């Protein structure tokens, strides 16, 4: 009794499979069926009408699959072979002779359309990994192998879809999106990427960093206590040394996470990007960010008070440890403020877009060319430091 919805469209609907329901309507007349097939079919809405960017970007398990598939380990089973093609890479991997991240060398053939839309072939010994070569079998023709020779996070995937759409066209891109989803799910499963309590690695320095910050703040506290520094000065400097401490703990944990796997090369040890599953999730772009990783294994910073003011003592705990009662009770304020705000902003945004759609409902593209010479001078938008939007984007 459940409506089964393709995953790639979820972001469009802004859908969750956490209880959300959808409504189905059945177009009756022939005109309605043809409109649905030609205008409102899913395979036509791949670019968004807000900005020309794709709206069918793969979201979370599929980007984690592609990511993990397409990363490289510094010395893995079957390293340094010479593979006769992508099919041999897949055969190797499935038969268990080479790891998925084995820096290997394979002969690939990429077609590039140089003539009046004529794909000419270029074969070469690319230096790649097994996973990348396997993924190559999914890519349509007119695309360059450079598009899969990276570590292929979320953004890279979306731009690969966009380039396929700009080079080839609609149908190949739709088939491409389906293949990407399938293969990303497949290798996300094969990976068995999980999350355990050991993955949130606390930096060994967090204790020292915080102790030094506390010494510093007690120093400023007594300096005010004698009166050398005003109360406003005292509170401010307290805030500032705490912020520096929080930033230091962030840097420490991110350094311990983002490369931790020092592993041995065919000789002596060496270091590489990590495979900490929480780091992989955050780094691919599947889920999380430096913000949330930070709250998991760093310290969850300073909290604001209902009046928007910031409290002196920050939450020096993280969710991997326990928040004591006061720290938790403090965080609850920010959390409830966030929730109330989302509710009320739902209402307000609805009212706004209603006013917008009514002021502008009747605007239709009626004529083909007014043949006028007015215009505006679109220029890249700089403010102080540097460009916020380049020209290319604005024209």
């Amino acid at each position: 009794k459940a409506i089964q919805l393709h995953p790639l469209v979820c972001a469009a609907y802004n859908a969750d499979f956490d209880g959300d329901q959808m409504a189905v309507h059945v177009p009756l007349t022939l005109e309605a069926q043809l409109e649905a097939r030609a205008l409102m079919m899913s395979t036509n809405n791949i670019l968004s009408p807000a900005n020309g960017e794709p709206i069918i970007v793969p979201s979370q398990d599929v980007v984690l699959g592609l990511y993990y598939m397409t990363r490289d380990c510094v010395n893995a089973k079957g390293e340094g072979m010479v593979l006769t093609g992508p099919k041999e890479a897949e055969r190797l991997y499935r038969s268990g002779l080479a790891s998925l991240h084995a820096r290997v060398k394979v002969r690939i053939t990429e077609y590039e359309k140089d003539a009046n839309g004529e794909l000419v072939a270029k074969t070469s010994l690319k230096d790649t990994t097994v996973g990348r070569a396997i993924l190559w079998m999914i890519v349509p023709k007119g695309l360059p192998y450079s598009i899969v020779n990276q570590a292929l996070g979320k953004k890279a995937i979306s731009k690969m879809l966009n380039t396929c759409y700009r080079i080839l066209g609609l149908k190949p891109t739709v088939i491409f999106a389906d293949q990407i989803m399938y293969t990303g799910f497949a290798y996300a499963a094969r990976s068995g990427a999980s999350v355990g309590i050991d993955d949130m690695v606390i930096p060994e320095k967090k204790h020292e960093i915080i102790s030094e910050a506390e010494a510093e703040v007690a120093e400023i506290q007594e300096q005010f206590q004698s009166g050398l520094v005003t109360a406003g000065e005292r509170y401010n400097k307290v805030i500032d040394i705490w912020a520096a401490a929080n930033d230091r703990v962030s840097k420490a944990m991110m350094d311990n996470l983002q490369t931790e796997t020092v592993i041995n090369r065919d000789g002596q040890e060496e270091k590489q990007v990590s495979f900490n599953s929480i780091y992989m999730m955050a780094d691919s772009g599947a889920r999380g960010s430096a913000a949330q990783i930070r709250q998991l294994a760093g310290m969850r910073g300073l909290m604001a008070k209902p009046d928007g003011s910031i409290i002196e003592t920050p939450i020096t705990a993280n969710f991997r440890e326990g928040l004591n009662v006061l720290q938790y009770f403090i965080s609850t304020h920010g959390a409830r403020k966030g929730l109330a705000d989302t509710a009320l902003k739902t209402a307000n945004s609805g009212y706004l877009t209603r006013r917008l759609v009514d002021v502008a409902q009747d605007l239709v593209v009626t004529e083909d060319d007014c043949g006028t010479h007015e215009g505006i001078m679109m220029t890249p938008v700089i403010e102080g430091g540097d460009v916020k939007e380049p020209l290319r984007d604005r024209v």
Partner: protein
């Protein structure tokens, strides 16, 4: 900023303390002394000069006591009511602004 800021830009609301603008080009002068408001008469060096405007005394005038100012120029400081942008600098001005 946020949703209220967009609602205000699109509702074209006057921003409670509008940075007043110079309607016409020409030299400026100060006139009546504080009935509650100083008179500034932008005095076109060429055309119909006599335009004057009574302005409260709280606005610090970028422009000098006697100064050759141009139309649609900032005089007081603050936000710019889009109505004035439109009226004085044209259409493209207000749309760039919005």
């Amino acid at each position: 900023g946020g949703l209220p800021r967009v609602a205000d830009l699109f509702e074209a609301r006057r921003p409670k303390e509008p940075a007043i603008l110079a309607e016409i080009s020409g030299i400026v002068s100060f006139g009546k002394e504080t009935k509650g408001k100083r008179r500034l008469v932008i005095t076109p060096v060429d055309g119909s000069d006599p335009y004057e405007e009574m302005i409260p005394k709280w606005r610090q005038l970028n422009v000098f006591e006697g100064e050759r100012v141009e139309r649609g120029d900032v005089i007081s400081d603050g936000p710019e009511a889009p109505h004035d942008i439109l009226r004085l600098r044209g259409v493209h001005a207000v749309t760039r602004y919005i």
